Write a protein that binds this ligand. Sequence first.
Ligand SMILES: [Mg+2]
Ligand SMILES: [Mg+2]
Ligand SMILES: [Mg+2]
Ligand SMILES: [Mg+2]
Ligand SMILES: [Mg+2]
Lengths: 290, 51, 247, 95, 50
Amino acid sequence: DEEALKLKQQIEAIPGNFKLFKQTKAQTQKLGAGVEVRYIPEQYLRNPPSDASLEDLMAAQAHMGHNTSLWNPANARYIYGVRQGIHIISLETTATHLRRAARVVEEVAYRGGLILFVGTRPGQRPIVVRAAELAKACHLFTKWRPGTITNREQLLGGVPLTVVDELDRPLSGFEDHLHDRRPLAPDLVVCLNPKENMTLLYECSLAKIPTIGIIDTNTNPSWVTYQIPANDDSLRATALISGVLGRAGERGQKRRLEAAQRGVVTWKTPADVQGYFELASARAADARRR
Amino acid sequence: EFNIVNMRSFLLNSDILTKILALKLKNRNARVIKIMDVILNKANLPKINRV
Amino acid sequence: FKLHPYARAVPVSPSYFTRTPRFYDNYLSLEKLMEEYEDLPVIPATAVERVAWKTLEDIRKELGEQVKASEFARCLALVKRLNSIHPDLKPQEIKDVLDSFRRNVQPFTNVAKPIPIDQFGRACGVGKRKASSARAFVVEGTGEVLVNGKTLAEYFGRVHDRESAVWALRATNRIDKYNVWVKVEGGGTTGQAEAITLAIAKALLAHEPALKPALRRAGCVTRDPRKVERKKHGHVKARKMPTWVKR
Amino acid sequence: DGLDDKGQYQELKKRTGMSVRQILQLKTKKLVHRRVVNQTRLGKIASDSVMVIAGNGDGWLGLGMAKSVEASIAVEKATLLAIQNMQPIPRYENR
Amino acid sequence: GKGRIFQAAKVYQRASEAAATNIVSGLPPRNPPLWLKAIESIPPAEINTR
RNA sequence: GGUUCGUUCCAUGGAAUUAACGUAAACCCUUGCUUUAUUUGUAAAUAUUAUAAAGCAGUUCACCUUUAUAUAGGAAAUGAU
Ligand SMILES: [Mg+2]
Ligand SMILES: [Mg+2]
Ligand SMILES: [Mg+2]
Ligand SMILES: [Mg+2]
Ligand SMILES: [Mg+2]
């Protein structure tokens, strides 16, 4: 029966072997020579770049367009040429449209806006969740429920909210307001696949919300407000684009918080909350009277 | 012996509810469809989680 | 003491616009623990003690969300993966978060009482068939069977019913080793015979419990639940209906 | 102030964000009133389709359309649906 | 003509006009969306031009 | 597009999210077991028919097979029950 017990003392050795193995991995490793590691698959998440250069965009396959036949002729202003039977998106057009978008994400985050990073694809969940953390925004990595903006009253009815202030800390006293208030809507939607989910973008146009999308060679550029011509089918290009936009929001949220500690609010109270103010004093006016 | 139970609202009993609505509808000028909405609007239901 | 001049509504959870906010918040947490604690060793699947994880219905209720079956299946794999970590090396956070997925349900226990044996060695079995209720007292004997104080041939005028009554002893080849004293009530001839079959079987199993597999294949352990249907209004009988006239 | 105890303007009070006394100061009018019919397995179903315009009188106008089996429920739908669809209409010299 | 009309390239123009005046005449307009001043000086680029 | 006794369940749709009735569930009788009660019912009795209050139980487990890996199904006197 020892043949069945010889797996236990082996399990009792895993902690010892692991500890000794990890220690051994620190001494001998890196002895031979220094490696010039200039690319890691998970580098756009651990430390995304502040800006994207022509080399970063080309290395991430951001210039690979769709087949020449499967193209929207309207979006031919960004195509550089044809090669390998596909349309090549101009690297300089992508960098310019990307920096311009990074400026929109920063300003919207600097003015206390609610951003929504949307990437709905098999492997786009870690990318979108990471960018939302940096920018302190909301993420969406699943199918967009039609009507979450135009019919928010029903869909987002029971989801809880909170009232914050200059330094983004809760304010006690708006409990009654958080039950009659209607749900929120994003102030800026950053879609990473506008071709797939057109129901979300149309609602934003109907609801007067600015949008940013990665327009591929076959996507209609008239669906978003700020286009980023690039390859959306490459999971490596999506991570770079979203990474740059994530850093933008982070840089914007910092300035907003740095300006609040000096008593300089970069935004005025929203219209809905503002209305609940004058009504609050109106109720208090009766107390002074009676 | 009598055990009269005083009701706070008239919606907690079907007998009292159908009689009130019947007296309201006895008038020739009674707006039938409108008197029913006034009653339902007075019926408060507790919030619930559908799931 | 009034409201703050500057204020704005902000969502509590980052997955505010998702299908199931509360679920993804818990799912993303596992993904966060699966990236930093992935370097720890693992235990073979055959050495990890079994655990009864929660089902899709249990999660749908506590979270109040309509979680998708597929999205939950991929989330359960994480729990199974994080569970294979070595216990000693397993951190404290993974332990607690893994305890919220355990299904602490206990099914009801309904164990039948064993048929005892009298001081004189007579075990009492009970059988019923469609009206009847037999009570067979089986003892070691020479094979004498008495039903209601009468011999098997004096009570059952049909040899088919006699064999069915003692079929339990016949299939096991023990007619010449037990004395049966039966007492039946209600039912007809065959109904009483089939009831005596189940009675002797239960009584016989009190003496030799190892005969159940044989009585199983002989058909003396199953309680036939068939019962006379009732008559229904509009019908002549249970199912038969009166003549339907088209014209 | 007891003006709206039917609960009809409550939802509209959130979208538009203005008092109920102000919602009644708008110029509403039922322009069109059609009597549409749909043939189903259970016979005809006759509905009323009503279009209502809501206007502030100083450069805001909205158009709402709805229908229902009752002519009254259809007018209330378009009224609320027209007050929330208001848009600023440019006008030369406000005339 | 089956496709829907996307007015995403005019959200600022449309949204800004809706905030110039208040529905209730005689009162000051309420505060606009928090994004109106963020993209104030970042107009879209010309699209759909071969 | 599959699946299910079933608009049942899963997946999916460039539009959906939900409510009521029916459906379903539950209820009555019946089947097995447990506990309580022993007369006007039961030969005796250390309690086993009957009587009737409450509770549990199923397709549950095992085996075989299994699509898109998401939802599962088959086998029917010789696995358990
Ligand atoms: Mg593509
Ligand atoms: Mg009969
Ligand atoms: Mg559907
Ligand atoms: Mg007696
Ligand atoms: Mg009994």
